[PDB]
Structure formats: structure tokens, C-alpha cells
């Protein structure tokens, strides 16, 4: 699969990409000099756990095209950019490793965190890995990395082999942690990638993100191991913890710069530990705001607490039975029909094991928008905005516009599948369908 | 006239109803087995004394579509939402009888008190006439009950002469406070509701209404007979108003079931005086929202004082002369002249005794505005609406759309009596004139 | 069959109406407190002598709606306006009984006998009821229509029976002149009515239709029976006819009120008779245009003063034999064909003893169009338009929109059986088809 | 709820119907001079099984629009297709009575049985109820029923007394197995008819309907009562049943001409009867022809038997679980998605609990047609013609016109709900399909 982010010469720029699993969006950004499946450790895991896996490569790595032009952090983020925006993404984690990680700071700081849901650095860069006076922090000079690209145009092949003693501690975890044939697959990937690139890449770590850190604002999290050659944890993730004190700050020890695969355990441990505490995070934040809005149209009494409860349980993840929810809803006294439609949409909305029930003829019509024309046209012309939308923030306002009676048919038209958009906007047009309907 | 409310197969679903009188909006639901025309003798009464009557027929019954389908008090109480949403009634009165109490408390528990005014509760079935183990209070068994849908479905026809034996105490009151032709006629109502609908009304009288009768919040009134066969006074209305503290209790002593036609003196009588209360509360609302619009485009000073005093007192009925009035108006200083038009338009609406005072000039000159001809044109146009309009709501919002320029000529045509509206709809307009002034 | 006169609220105001036959429009305006069908007797009746009857039921009774506003005779005469507009009638005959007396008087006065050919009074309100000073010649004073109001008010399902007592004078004709039955249908018809209306109708009988009077142009006739106890024929009809000396003056002799049921053969003998003059002179005023019309397409000479005399010998009734003619028709040589067709098209509408003669084969093949495909479609198009047609100028204008090759083939359809038209109608499309053709 | 079945003058012609339940279509035509309530005791019934319920007012009867003209069987007839038509019904059963029976006889002769499943003639006119030369076994001759069209025209009203009198067998019946009041309700129905429908009903009962018998080859059921004294049995349903000796004759002995609410008992256990064992009639041959077509594509082997096993026992009624049989289609070895997903198609088409399952995934990807708009734009256009089919032999043929990649997605439309077609309909499609498929 590929998502074309350029165009060089004659030939179109084209980034080889995966998009495996269903859940959240975890986009996996590679490290240098390999590419997205070096990731198959973390990916692996990550579907179990019922995540959306996504990975790609970077330009001039992997089976992505190799330009000569665009290795830059400016670049790399736009093309990041386009990869979200194409799939469109929304309340998606960010995951960076090597290089991956100035990927991650400068897409935030450039593009917002409107799809991003939180972020994660793993190996770090940041904040600036140039030693200078402004900087003393920095783990080398200017002429130390222009070393490097020398020693890469000198034989791009040998260089490789002297890479990865150093990216896995082959020294330490060679038999142990990491097998001959595993590093042997690893060089490949590393031959199989462009030549221009190869030599292009390492002058883009000195890349200064001390300006990035700031704009962060998504719950964030910083993976280091204390054995890193190539980046070592002083110059790196400790002087990155200071400029990010709010990040959850992991240090595992004794691993190298390669710990994606050495010490994959200790790794995803960590990942799928604040991966689930960012996920419930914000799905409390959202569903309360929706709790809230949907309380507001029930008639206050001992039914209306009854509603809550079931509402907690669910969000909670106490997977209740939805024949029976559907059925309690049905043949609940005192519940008007368009309470029990929306209810009902919400319900079907949020209950994960859908068991396989048909959209429920109390549902349609309360929905139906009476089988006028006009309702049925305004529904539509909403429903093409919806489309476009991707914040829940940003569905409600545009949903206000229109009237109660073209948001009851427009849920209608989602809810029979003559429509498909996302859940956070989902929620958006039901919670402004319930803010009309509370102003009557 | 009909009102949609269902389908049923290839037919649709139509209420007969009935729309006469202007003023406040007082709903009638009839009871079984009749109609809307049940209620003639309350509906005279009520339209002599000032009020907006709406009667119509429950599904299946009178001249309203007789389907085999939703004959449950959720579904008729979604009628009766049908009903008052598609004649958009506000700040109404529901009455109901025999069955007819079972939509109002339906009604009111499932949708809100929104367009509710207040409630009326004629010879109730409230709260549970079924007589069970957790329910003593109730009038008799599941049996019992069986008994009557069997009987129905025996011999409709031959059922209704039964039924009205004890429907209005006939050894009693025939010939007394009921006529022969009387019943003859209200069998025939009977005979001509449907089949279905015959037999499949007894299963709903057992319908348990004791979680919605918390659910009234409006004004409530209980009225029963004592000498009450079908429906017995202990087990319906006694009970029923130890859930209802709150609700204007009234026992009419030895009437019937059918007392609505037998005991009408004693029931409009009643009635009336619970009315009056609710509609003298809501005429003094009007006055104070036409006040305050008002008093919304006067600049704040000792003046406004002085024009807020005399407002109160000619809402409060004290006799103002009316040329003194126009004579100060006319001369006040500070006072833009369609400030003083608007309020010489009302002065001439609310002041009594007019004593044949010839169209003051200034007011006319006031009301012209600009002489924009799109002002001019717009005025008759809206002119043209507001004859048609009745509700005082419902003649401030379509006024509203038009702009103040137009509004004010719209003002001057009904001030040169080239025009005839009613003062519900005129305050309506000069509630939507002060709005669109103070609104820039 | 509905016609929108009004509307009250939410609601708009329809009357039932009627239209049965084909002829001269004779409208029948029933009296209190029944409907339209009341004169089903005379319906029958008319009907046989080839009328176009129409019938329709007064605001709050029978079928129509039941307002509670537009109880007067000037709303009274504009929802008979209404009627006659809508319907088009033009050279119409009103029938009034009872309170239709009061219709007919003011439509005449108020709107000009423009579509009116002529009027019929029978048990006339007419000219004044009221007992007063000015008007001795009253039946009763202000005092008892008050009660009779109060009476209606009281119960008028009971009030429906006593009232019936005087209308038939069933102590005199129950048994002998009227059935139980049918009166116990007309109690019916009273029932269904409006409860408002019922009472509002009383105080409508005192009207003053003395200045309505001198406005009558067309010729009249004045029926009543002498037995009448509702309205007693002194002071009606008596001084009726002093004000309306050139009316034609009819006494049935012991007959009461409601006596177009009770002496319905004494009623439609008089009226069938009145009515006569009035068809018969609209009769030649159409066969003159069908001689007119289809002379101008015979060339000048003998011949044309043959046809003229044998087209004049079957209008005036003159049986004249038809196997004769169409031989005559057959062999003249000067004659064209069509000509010839459309000759023997009129030939066997217009004679009434066709005798069981088989379609002739020379006017099938003048008819036939050139057996055009083209010809035969634009035939049937027409045909599809001619059947919705009940007048004849209004299937002449429509019909002139054709082709005279068109309009030959249509006549061919018709002449075949393939057709079915009323004559009216057929005559509109010979005299169409005659227009062509003079215009060739 | 009314159906236009043609125009009278000014006037359009509508016939008042109602459509109740759901199943196949059981059509049933009242007698005179009734309408269709009297059909209360069949349809209460008739629902209770199950069935689908339609009944309508024949012209001038009833609630049905009362013309002067078009009271003859073939006018009745013409209706009856109007009806049959507007409402689109397939696969029904006509049942008449009295006047009805007539209807049946001359629709299914002019019409053709294609919308019909099965006849019932109750009191049945039939063969020719005139005595004559030809016709010996006629009940009376011509002066006979020129006498009884006198009687209504001398008094309607009084006529429906006597009439009621035979109809029922009052001397018998009257307060056995007809009640007083049951007998005023008929009467009531009566006077509501037509008056010049009353007097032109009667001239249609001598119809001669022995040639429309032989064009009856849907299977037939005559039933009548031995004490009929309005249709004597021996000049009726004897001579009736020897001519249609194919027919199930039934003899209720002592049943009155209106048997249909005095023996009502034993009218709806014989009708239902004979329903029951024509609906399993053609469910079993046409059941057994999709059978064939479904097993056609299936490879021969052990799991053919058991398909062909689960198939019979859902088409037996041995309503089976759904959830059970989709797992045990989705988990079975060998079976082809395309297979699975038609005869997922046809399981949820043929079950009738559908007990809420969604539409499964396997099923619409199956029928999805790979995503060529190609397949899809064939897919509509054969929509479009099978929404105007209506036998399953026409639906199979013009199905196979088109490829089976196009009907294959054409099926899925209906599946996904994205199409409405008539489940006769629906079986020819997948049966083309599956013919399409074997070939090759």
C-alpha cells in the first residue's frame, strides 16, 4: 500500500504503509536506517491488545520511493501529514523510535494536536542532539556528524554492519536478546533503502527541537534505555525529561539504542500501560460530556438515575447484554419515543460486542423526522458537513445550525447506514440534537 | 379536519378533530366508548367563556380512523403529542374523561409540561384500577377484565346497551337528567367506532399509571362522581389523590360515570373556576412581557419611570383618560417619534373607553417610518399572516422574519383601522417591533 | 364531494356536496336541521326528466364542517356563491326549502341572477318572520325564537324529536304519508349535525329578506302547503306573494312542512312542471347551435333546405323513420363524405327510437380518418379529455384544439362504441368538427 | 382511507377501504346493502390467523362515494381490479357475499387469475338467479325483480325493515344468534347507502354469470346456508356446485341468508379451513421450486442432504433458530461464500421470527458483485423492473436476461434494504440466479 506525499522529477514521491487491526489509531514512526517492519514486535502486541496499528515508511527507507531531495524534519512532518490526513485519522497515538521521534515533536508543533489523542518517544532525539555553547547539553559537535555522512558515502554497505554492533549492543545481547539471523534481516532492510538517503539522514539528527517541546499539550510519554550507544540517555531522554516534566518518563535499564526488539518486553509493557491509561482518559472526558447531554433530555425521577447507571456501566466497559437493554428500553414506561431513539442510537453506539441485532423498528421511527421532504433535505446538507468534520468540539457547533427535527433525520440516516461517520462526530450531532431539544 | 398521527399498512392514520373559539387552548379527550362530540356541552360553555376549544377522536373511535394496531397508552399518548405539536398549542389546558385521563397522565409523564398549562382529571382511571396483590386499591381482577373484552367480542353492539346503563346510572337519571334520545344517539357513536378498537380498549383501563402521576408538576384538577359504577370513587379518585396532594380536589355527589351530559352544571361550573385561575395567570403574563419589550426601547430615565406607571395602570385597569395620554405623549421631550407611535399604538390597543377619539396624527406619522417602499410592501405583506394568526407566540415569531422598518408601517396599517386584528396577535407584533429596535 | 367556502383556525370549512346527471344545473338547498339528502325524492324525480342535479349541505349540518362562526345568510348566500363558482354552473335553476329559501332570496339580491335561469321558494322563510310593529305580518316575536335557541341549548337530541312532530304533522301522516323509518333517519341526520349549529340556526329564521325581495328578475315559483304549522302560510308564502305578484303561486292543499317526503308527488309534479319551461327553452337554444353548425358545412341549394327541414322535424320530436334517412343520407351524390358521417353521427344521437339499427357502414368509413395512426392516436388524447367534459361549450373549446382529421376519428370512436360520452359533450365535438371544416 | 376508482360529473369516485394485519391478502367483498364492517366477525378472525385483512365499500354503499351510474358487474368488477391494483396485491384470496360473490366471479373471469390465489363464494348469486326458458333453474322471473327495485323507490328506509327481516330470519334467529341491537346497526349501515344505489342494486342480481364460471381455475370454495331464504339454495350454490364440481362445497344447515354474523362460528371455521389448506398449497409448490434451484448450486455430497433437510423443515413452519442456522452456514466446510451468501439470503426471506439478527457480514460481501459499477448499474436497472413484476414465473424470466455477476449484486441490494420487492418477486430472482450459475 502506498500514499503519495511528492512528486520528484518525472516520478511521483510514494510512502509504502500498513494499516492492520481494528480500534485507535497507533501510528509506529521507524528509526533509522529501517523501516516500518522493524516495528512487528510492538505491532504484534498492539493487535492483541485491539488497537489500529498503523506503520509507514520514511521517504528513501524501506519500500517507500527514494528521492533525492526533502530529508528534512519540515518534510518528514509534512509527509506525515499527508499519511494522517489521507487515512484521515482522529484521536490517534503517535509513536516515534530514533528519528521517529522528530517526526512526532515537529508534527505537533507545525499541524496541532487536533487528531493526535497523545504521544510517545521512544529513543529520543529531542531536545538537540548538536553540541554547542548554546547547547552544552548536546552529545556531539558539528564536525563528529559530518563523520558520519562521510563514513556512510564511503561504503554504504560496511557502514551498516558497524551500525548495528552499536544499535543492539551486539557485545551484551547477541545470542541473548537479539539472534545472528534477526540482525542479518535488519542489515537487508538497511541495503534495501536509497543511496542519497542514506548519507541525507544523519544530518537531520542534529535537527533543533527545543522549540517543538513546548507545543505538546497531549499526554506524552518518553522511553529511553539506559545502555544507548548511539544516543546516550544524559544528552537525550534526561535533558527531554526536564524541557517535558508532565511525560511519563520511563527508563529501562541496561538496554541499547535497538531495544524495540532487545528488550521488546520491557517495552511494550510500558507502551500498552500508558496507551491504556491515555484511551480511558479520553473516553471518560468524552463520554460524560455525552452522559450529560443525553440526562438532559430524560424527565427527572427514579428513571432518570436508572438511565445513568446503565450509561456508567457501559462506558465503563461492563459489557451488558443489548437484547435486553433494548427490550428494557422498549417496554420502559414513561420514556418518550425519541428519547428511546436516541437512547437507542447511543446504545448501539457505544455496546462493543453489537451481538447482531437489527435496527430496532422503535428506533426508525422516532428517527424517521416525520416523512417530511424538508427535514430529509436539511439532513443531508448536514450530513455532507459531517463528513468533512473529525473534532466533536468542532461537529456540535455546525450541527447547533440546523433544526431538532433535521438532526432527528439525520441520525436517522447514520443509524439505518445510509451514512458513515466517525464516533466522535457521531457523538457531536447526537449531543446537539439533545441541546435543541433541551430549549424547548 | 384530520391529523396524521400513524400508518397502518397501505392506509395512513388520521384523528378527527375540532378547532373552535380564540383564546387559551383547552383540550378535550374524550372517553369510551364515544367521541369528541361527548364534550358539547363543556365546549359551549367554554366558548361562551372566552377559550380556544380542541377536541378529537381516539383512534379507532368516532370519525377517526379505526386501525387494528397501538392500542396502548404509549401510543396514545404520542397521538396526543401529534396533535398539539402539529397545532403547535402553548401554555394549554388537557382535559381529560374516563379514558381520557389516562393520555393526559401519560402524556405529561412521557413529554414534559413543556406546552402544558395545566391538567384537568374527569372521572380518572388513575392510578391502577387493576386489583392485585401490590395494588389492594384496585377496583377489580385480571378476570374481571377478560370478562368485558369477551363481551365486546361477543356481541359489540348488544354490549353498548349494557354499557350505558351503568355509563350513566339510567335507572336513575333516565328521564331525569338524561333524555332517551340522548343515549340513543351516543349508542350510536358507539356502534359506529371499530370493531377492533371495541375490544381492544378494556385491556388498557388496567394500564398501571402510578409512575407517572409524580411526573405533574402543572396545576392539577381531580373531579369524580360518587355514585360512580364503572369507575368507583374509592378505588380511582380517593386514591388517586393521596398520589396528588397537590391537584384542586372535587366530588360531585351522586353523579355518574357519564356525568360530563347528567351532571354538566355541576362539572362546567367546576371547571370553569379551575380555568379561570389558569387563565387569568397567563393573561397577566402577556401584559408584563408586552411591558418590558416596551420599556426595552425607552432611554433609562425619570420619564421611563413615569411611562412604566401608566402602563401598570392601565394593565391594572384604572380608568386613564386616553386624550390626556396622547396629549402628553405628543408632548414629550427626549422621546424619538416612533418610540412615542409605538406607545400611542398601544395606549389606543389597551386603554377602555375610547369615547370616539378621531387617529391621533402623530401616531400615524410615527409609524410610516422611512417611506421605503420595501418597508410599505413588506408591511402588507406581513399584514396579510397576521389575519390568519391567532396565538400571541405564534404571531411574534412570524414578525420577527420582517425587518423594523416594516414592521412599524405594518403597525401603522392596523392603527388606520385598515386593518382588524385581534389584541393577542397586536401584542405579538409590537413584542417583535420593540425586539428588532432593541436589537441594533 | 367537498367545496372550501371558509376557514376556522387550524381547520378550513368544506361543504359536502353532490353532483349527479346530466342536463340543466338545478341546485336544491335543504332546510333545518337536515342535509342534502332530504331531496332525494325530488333527486330521484329530476333526474328521470334528465336533469343535472346538485346538492350540498349547509355549514354544521350533514356532512359539511361544524364550525362555530358564520351563522348569518350573508355567509349563508357567499357559501353558495362559492359553490356556483367553483362548479361553474352557468343558466342554473335554485331550488330552497325552509331556510334555503333564505339562501336563494340573498344570493339573488347580493350576487345578481348572472348564473341563474330561475328560482323556486318552497316552504318559504320569506319576506320577514319576525313579529315586530313595522312587520304585523310576523309569525312570532323576538321572545320565542329565544326560546327555541334555549330549547336546542337544553337538549337537542330530545328537541330533534318534537320538532319533527310539526315538520311532518305525524299525528296526521305517520302511518299514511311518511314511514317511522324514515323519520327515524331524518332524527339521524339532525343528530350528526353540529351542536353549535344547531342552536346558532334559530335565531337565523328571523332575517328580513323584504329588500332582497324586488331583486328576483328571473321567474319564480312559490310552493307551500297550508297545513304548514312551522311556518305558517299566512305569514309567509300569503305575504310573500303581494311582494312577488309575478311568481308563479302553488297551494298544497293540507300539507305540512316537511313536505317534500310526505306530498313529494303533489311537489315534483309543480316543480317538474316550473322547471320545464326553463329546460325546454335551454334545449332549443342548444339545438339551434347544432343545426347552425352542422348546415354550414352542407353546400348551398335544395338540398341544404331538405336537411334543415328533416333536422328541425327530429328536434321538435317528429319520428321520423332512421333506416329511411341513413338511405337518403347514404345516396346523395353531392354530399361528401364526411359530411355524410357526421350527418349520420347526429342522425342517431338525436333520434330516440334507433330501432336496433346496426351501425352503418358509410358513416363508420367516413369516420374512420384515413385509418391515420396518427389521426387515431390525437383521437383517443382527445377522447381521454372528452370524457372528463360534462358542458357543452366547454367540449367545443377543447375540441377546437384538434385537427380536423383528429376530430373526425374521435366522432368515430364514439359512433363505434368504443366510446362513451355524454351527449352535451357529443354535440361539442360535432359542432368542433363542423368548425374545422367550414374553415377548411 | 379511500381508493378513486373513477369520476362522476364534478365529482371524482373514491370507494372507502381498510387494510388490516399482515400475511397474505384476504380480499372480502360485502353484500347489499350493507358495507364492508359486516365483515367484523371474519376479520376479527381472519387477524387473529394471521392474515392480512383488506375490505372496501362497493359505490353508492357504505362510506363509498354514491354515483348515479356504473351499477353493473362489470363497472363492480372494473373497481375491484382498481383496487387490487392500487394496492398492488399478490397471491389473494377473494371471499364475497350476497352481491360480492358476483364480483369474484366476473374479475376473475375479465381479469384473469394472476394477483389471485384462491376464491370463496358465501351466499352466492350464481349461476343466474332469472327465471327464464334457457334457465330454468332461476329462483324468479323478470316482473319478480322489478318489483323489489319498486319497493326500495316507493321507501328506502321502510324497505331495509323487511328486508332484514328474511335477511337474517328474525322469527328464528332474533335473540339467539342476532341480537336487537346488532339488526338496528345493519339498518343504520343501510340508510347510510346511497338512495339511488339502493334502487339500482337489486336490477343487478339477475346477472347471467354462467359464463364466467369456467374461467375460474384457482381452487374454489361455495358455501350457503339451507335456510336462506333471500338466495334459495337449490336455485343458487346447488345448481352453483354442479356447475364448478371442482369447488369444496360446504351446507350450513340452517343458516339464514346473513349467515355471516348468525352462524358465524361455522362460516369462519369452514373459511379458515379452506385457507389454511390453500396458503400451505402454494407454499409447498412454490417452496419446492426453490428448493430445486437452491440445491441446483450446491455440490452433491452429505452436506446437500442436510441442506436440503434444514430447508423443508423451514418451509414445514418448524420455525428453527436463525442465529443457529447463520453460525451453522458461516462455520460449514465446503460451502462457497456466493452459496452461503444465498442461502443467507433466502433463510432470513423464508423464516419468520427473524428474531433480530444483523445483516450478516459473510452474506454481504458474498452478494456485494466484487465493486464493478458495472455489475451495480445492471444490478438498478433490474431492480426497477422487478419492482413492477409481480408473478414469480414473470420475475425469473426477465431476471435471466441479465448476468449473474449483475444479479448477484441485485440481490444484495434487497438484502441490504437498499431495494422493496415482493417476496413472490424476491424468489424469482433467486432462482434466476441460481439457473444462471449452473450453467456454468
Same mark, same amino acid.
Given at each position: 500500500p502506498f500514499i503519495t506525499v511528492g512528486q520528484e522529477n518525472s516520478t511521483s514521491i510514494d510512502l509504502y504503509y500498513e494499516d492492520h487491526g481494528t480500534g485507535t489509531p497507533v501510528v509506529l514512526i521507524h528509526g533509522f536506517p529501517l523501516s516500518g517492519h522493524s516495528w512487528e514486535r510492538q505491532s504484534a502486541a498492539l493487535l492483541d491488545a485491539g488497537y489500529r496499528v498503523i506503520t509507514y515508511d520514511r521517504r528513501g527507507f524501506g519500500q517507500s520511493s527514494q528521492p533525492t531531495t526533502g530529508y528534512d524534519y519540515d518534510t518528514f512532518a509534512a509527509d506525515l501529514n499527508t499519511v494522517l490526513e489521507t487515512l484521515d485519522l482522529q484521536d490517534a497515538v503517535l509513536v516515534g523510535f530514533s528519528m521517529g521521534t522528530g517526526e512526532v515533536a515537529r508534527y505537533v508543533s507545525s499541524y496541532g494536536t487536533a487528531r493526535i489523542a497523545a504521544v510517545a518517544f521512544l529513543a529520543s532525539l529531542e531536545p538537540f542532539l548538536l553540541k554547542t555553547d548554546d547547547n552544552p547539553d548536546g552529545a556531539a559537535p558539528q564536525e563528529f556528524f559530518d563523520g558520519i555522512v562521510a563514513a556512510v558515502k564511503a561504503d554504504r554497505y560496511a557502514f551498516y554492519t558497524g551500525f548495528f554492533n552499536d544499535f543492539y549492543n551486539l557485545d551484551e545481547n547477541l545470542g541473548t536478546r537479539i539472534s545472528e539471523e534477526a540482525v542479518r534481516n535488519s542489515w537487508n532492510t538497511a541495503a534495501s533503502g536509497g543511496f542519497f538517503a542514506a548519507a541525507a539522514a544523519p544530518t537531520t539528527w542534529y535537527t533543533d527541537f527545543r522549540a517543538d517541546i513546548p507545543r505538546i499539550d497531549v499526554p506524552a510519554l518518553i522511553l529511553h534505555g539506559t545502555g544507548d550507544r548511539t544516543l546516550p540517555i544524559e544528552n537525550t531522554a534526561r535533558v527531554f525529561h526536564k524541557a517535558l516534566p508532565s511525560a511519563e518518563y520511563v527508563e529501562v535499564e541496561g538496554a541499547p539504542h535497538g531495544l524495540l526488539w532487545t528488550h521488546a518486553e520491557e517495552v511494550n509493557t510500558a507502551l500498552l500501560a500508558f496507551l491504556a491509561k491515555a484511551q480511558e482518559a479520553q473516553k471518560q472526558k468524552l463520554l460524560t460530556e455525552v452522559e450529560t447531554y443525553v440526562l438532559s433530555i430524560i424527565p427527572s425521577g427514579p428513571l432518570k438515575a436508572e438511565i445513568a447507571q446503565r450509561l456508567e456501566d457501559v462506558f465503563a466497559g461492563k459489557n451488558t447484554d443489548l437484547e435486553v437493554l433494548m427490550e428494557w428500553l422498549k417496554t420502559r414506561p414513561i420514556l418518550s419515543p425519541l428519547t428511546k431513539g436516541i437512547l437507542g442510537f447511543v446504545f448501539t453506539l457505544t455496546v462493543p460486542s453489537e451481538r447482531g441485532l437489527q435496527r430496532r423498528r422503535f428506533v426508525q421511527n422516532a428517527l424517521n423526522? +416525520?416523512?417530511?421532504? +424538508? +427535514?430529509?433535505?436539511?439532513?443531508?446538507?448536514?450530513? %455532507?458537513?459531517?463528513? %468533512?468534520?473529525?473534532?466533536?468540539?468542532?461537529?456540535?457547533?455546525? *450541527?447547533? *445550525?440546523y433544526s431538532a427535527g433535521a438532526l432527528a433525520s439525520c441520525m436517522g440516516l447514520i443509524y439505518n447506514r445510509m451514512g458513515a461517520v466517525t464516533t466522535e462526530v457521531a457523538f457531536g450531532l447526537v449531543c446537539a440534537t439533545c441541546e435543541q431539544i433541551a430549549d424547548s
Amino acid at each position: 500500500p502506498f500514499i503519495t506525499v511528492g512528486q520528484e522529477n518525472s516520478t511521483s514521491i510514494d510512502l509504502y504503509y500498513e494499516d492492520h487491526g481494528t480500534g485507535t489509531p497507533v501510528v509506529l514512526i521507524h528509526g533509522f536506517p529501517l523501516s516500518g517492519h522493524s516495528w512487528e514486535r510492538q505491532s504484534a502486541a498492539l493487535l492483541d491488545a485491539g488497537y489500529r496499528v498503523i506503520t509507514y515508511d520514511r521517504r528513501g527507507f524501506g519500500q517507500s520511493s527514494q528521492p533525492t531531495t526533502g530529508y528534512d524534519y519540515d518534510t518528514f512532518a509534512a509527509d506525515l501529514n499527508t499519511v494522517l490526513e489521507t487515512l484521515d485519522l482522529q484521536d490517534a497515538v503517535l509513536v516515534g523510535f530514533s528519528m521517529g521521534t522528530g517526526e512526532v515533536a515537529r508534527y505537533v508543533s507545525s499541524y496541532g494536536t487536533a487528531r493526535i489523542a497523545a504521544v510517545a518517544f521512544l529513543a529520543s532525539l529531542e531536545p538537540f542532539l548538536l553540541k554547542t555553547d548554546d547547547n552544552p547539553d548536546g552529545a556531539a559537535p558539528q564536525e563528529f556528524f559530518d563523520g558520519i555522512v562521510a563514513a556512510v558515502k564511503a561504503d554504504r554497505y560496511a557502514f551498516y554492519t558497524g551500525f548495528f554492533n552499536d544499535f543492539y549492543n551486539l557485545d551484551e545481547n547477541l545470542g541473548t536478546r537479539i539472534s545472528e539471523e534477526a540482525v542479518r534481516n535488519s542489515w537487508n532492510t538497511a541495503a534495501s533503502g536509497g543511496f542519497f538517503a542514506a548519507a541525507a539522514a544523519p544530518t537531520t539528527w542534529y535537527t533543533d527541537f527545543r522549540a517543538d517541546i513546548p507545543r505538546i499539550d497531549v499526554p506524552a510519554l518518553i522511553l529511553h534505555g539506559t545502555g544507548d550507544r548511539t544516543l546516550p540517555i544524559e544528552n537525550t531522554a534526561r535533558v527531554f525529561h526536564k524541557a517535558l516534566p508532565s511525560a511519563e518518563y520511563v527508563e529501562v535499564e541496561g538496554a541499547p539504542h535497538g531495544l524495540l526488539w532487545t528488550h521488546a518486553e520491557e517495552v511494550n509493557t510500558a507502551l500498552l500501560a500508558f496507551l491504556a491509561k491515555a484511551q480511558e482518559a479520553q473516553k471518560q472526558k468524552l463520554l460524560t460530556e455525552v452522559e450529560t447531554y443525553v440526562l438532559s433530555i430524560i424527565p427527572s425521577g427514579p428513571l432518570k438515575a436508572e438511565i445513568a447507571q446503565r450509561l456508567e456501566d457501559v462506558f465503563a466497559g461492563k459489557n451488558t447484554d443489548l437484547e435486553v437493554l433494548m427490550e428494557w428500553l422498549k417496554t420502559r414506561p414513561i420514556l418518550s419515543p425519541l428519547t428511546k431513539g436516541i437512547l437507542g442510537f447511543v446504545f448501539t453506539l457505544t455496546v462493543p460486542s453489537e451481538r447482531g441485532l437489527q435496527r430496532r423498528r422503535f428506533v426508525q421511527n422516532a428517527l424517521n423526522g +416525520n416523512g417530511d421532504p +424538508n +427535514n430529509m433535505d436539511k439532513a443531508v446538507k448536514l450530513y %455532507r458537513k459531517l463528513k %468533512r468534520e473529525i473534532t466533536f468540539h468542532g461537529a456540535k457547533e455546525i *450541527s447547533l *445550525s440546523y433544526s431538532a427535527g433535521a438532526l432527528a433525520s439525520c441520525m436517522g440516516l447514520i443509524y439505518n447506514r445510509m451514512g458513515a461517520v466517525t464516533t466522535e462526530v457521531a457523538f457531536g450531532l447526537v449531543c446537539a440534537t439533545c441541546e435543541q431539544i433541551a430549549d424547548s
